[PDB]
């Protein structure tokens, strides 16, 4: 819910900064000349920064071993094979690359195999000034890295085409992350509309990071890959370690847990890594099955849960959800629905960005200037 608390960056500012620089008159030449006839340079610029350069395709020094080697037996005749083959394809790359920039007005992502071949990528990764676990990680997950990379068209000039490539740095690795799922919790009692709900708004991915915790509110800005979690910090908050306390004890004095109130008791499910939360309310039909032998459990109104051991699938209302078949150990932790601790008479049924204790203050306010302005009379 809390994605509106995020800051706002400029994903390709890094990359463009370098593009911008490639229009300085001296620069373009400094580059070509530095790849005199090497293929990986390290040209420091006339801005004054180091950029691993890279000629990946020589077409000038190919065409010019068959412009003059064919502007003579032609016009006209034939030459042979091999030369067609090894150009049809050589040129073809460029054509793709040109398609790609033209449709995405000069900026592509993911970065394609044409823009950078595994060949060329892994090599880049190898001489990147960065740790060794970074290297291995990147190498075993190239199609992800490609997804988090950008490619930025920069210049076509005399006899040279430059485009910048922006690649991720994984400055944080092998720290423990964890994922928090939350459905709404309401009172079950019978009169339709007599009922109060509350939800934890703090759902997301959470990863330990430099003594704090990076929190990712919109959990589809992260890709799990087995048990690795690729996130981007551009979409994160930096919170105290204490924020975990909300899971064992949502009332704790150390961190003030975040919630949302409403009166809107509606049935829904949340599928977890290894199970399924069910919020059943009203006249809803909520169920959990095994594909083979059908319904194996029927939920009562309120918020409950099942693991994916034995369960394939869960229906709530007319909504069937397949469960995640990942393997692991679930543990149910019985506890009193905290919503049962609140007097409906003085409960804030409209609160989108609130905390546990904000609700409390707001209650005391109500409670006090009820009871006082009352025995008064």
């Amino acid at each position: 819910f809390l994605g509106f608390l995020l800051g706002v960056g400029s994903a390709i500012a890094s990359g463009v900064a370098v593009s911008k620089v490639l229009h300085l008159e001296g620069e373009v030449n400094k580059i070509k000349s530095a790849l005199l006839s090497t293929n990986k340079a390290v040209v420091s610029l006339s801005n004054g920064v180091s950029v691993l350069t890279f000629k990946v395709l020589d077409l000038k020094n190919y065409i010019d071993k068959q412009l003059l080697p064919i502007l003579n037996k032609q016009s006209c005749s034939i030459s042979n094979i091999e030369t067609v083959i090894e150009f049809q394809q050589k040129n073809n790359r460029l054509l793709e690359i040109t398609r790609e920039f033209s449709v995405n007005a000069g900026v592509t992502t993911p970065v394609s195999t044409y823009m950078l071949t595994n060949s060329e990528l892994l090599s880049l990764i190898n001489d990147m000034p960065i740790t060794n676990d970074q290297k291995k990680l990147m190498s075993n997950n190239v199609q992800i890295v490609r997804q988090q990379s950008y490619s930025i068209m920069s210049i076509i000039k005399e006899e040279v085409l430059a485009y910048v490539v922006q690649l991720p740095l994984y400055g944080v690795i092998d720290t423990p992350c964890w994922k928090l799922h939350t459905s709404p919790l309401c009172t079950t009692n019978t009169k339709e509309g007599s009922n109060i709900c509350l939800t934890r708004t703090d759902r997301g991915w959470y990863c330990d990071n430099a003594g704090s915790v990076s929190f990712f509110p919109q959990a589809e800005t992260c890709k799990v890959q087995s048990n690795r979690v690729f996130c981007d910090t551009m979409n994160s908050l930096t919170l105290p370690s204490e924020v975990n306390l909300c899971n064992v004890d949502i009332f704790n004095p150390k961190y003030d847990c975040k919630i949302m109130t409403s009166k809107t008791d509606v049935s829904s499910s949340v599928i977890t890594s290894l199970g399924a939360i069910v919020s059943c309310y009203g006249k809803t039909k909520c169920t959990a099955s095994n594909k083979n032998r059908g319904i194996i459990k029927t939920f009562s109104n309120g918020c409950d849960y099942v693991s994916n051991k034995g369960v394939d699938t869960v229906s709530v209302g007319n909504t069937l959800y397949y469960v995640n078949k990942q393997e692991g150990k679930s543990l149910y932790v019985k506890g009193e629905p905290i919503i049962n601790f609140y007097d409906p008479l003085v409960f804030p049924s409209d609160e989108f960005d609130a905390s546990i204790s904000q609700v409390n203050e707001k209650i005391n306010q109500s409670l006090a200037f009820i009871r006082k302005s009352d025995e008064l009379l």
């Binding site: 890094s14 990359g15 463009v16 229009h23 580059i31 000629k55 990946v56 395709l57 077409l59 020094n61 064919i70 502007l71 006209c76 034939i78 067609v84 150009f87 040129n91 054509l95 040109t98 920039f101 000069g106 960065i130 490619s151 068209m153 076509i156 040279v160 085409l161 430059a162 910048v164 490539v165 740095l169 994984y170 400055g171 944080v172 690795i173 720290t175 992350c177 928090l180 799922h181 934890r200 759902r203 990863c207 990071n209 799990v224 087995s226 048990n227 690795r228 996130c231 910090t233 899971n247 949502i250 977890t272 290894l274 199970g275 918020c303 692991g328 543990l331 932790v333 506890g335 009193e336």
Partner: protein, 78 residues
């Protein structure tokens, strides 16, 4: 990978544990380059076969080079 999860009936919520980070903290730029000849229209009439074909893979080529020129002198749209 020992992945594991707990449901809290108190607060209708659940935590999945046992995951390992990989966070994009920074960026690695690097220029990628391609060298190009420019050539005239100087060509031919003919021809036997395997240069009527090599001429076609060359219409396309300048065609490309033309579009890339269209992307002239501006900030790219992020």
């Amino acid at each position: 990978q020992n992945i594991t999860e707990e449901f809290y009936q108190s607060t209708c919520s659940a935590v999945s544990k046992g995951y390992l980070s990989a966070l994009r903290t920074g960026w690695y730029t690097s220029v990628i380059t391609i060298e190009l000849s420019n050539i005239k229209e100087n060509k031919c009439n003919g021809t036997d076969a395997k240069v009527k074909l090599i001429k076609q893979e060359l219409d396309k080529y300048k065609n490309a080079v033309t579009e890339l020129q269209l992307l002239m002198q501006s900030t790219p749209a992020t």
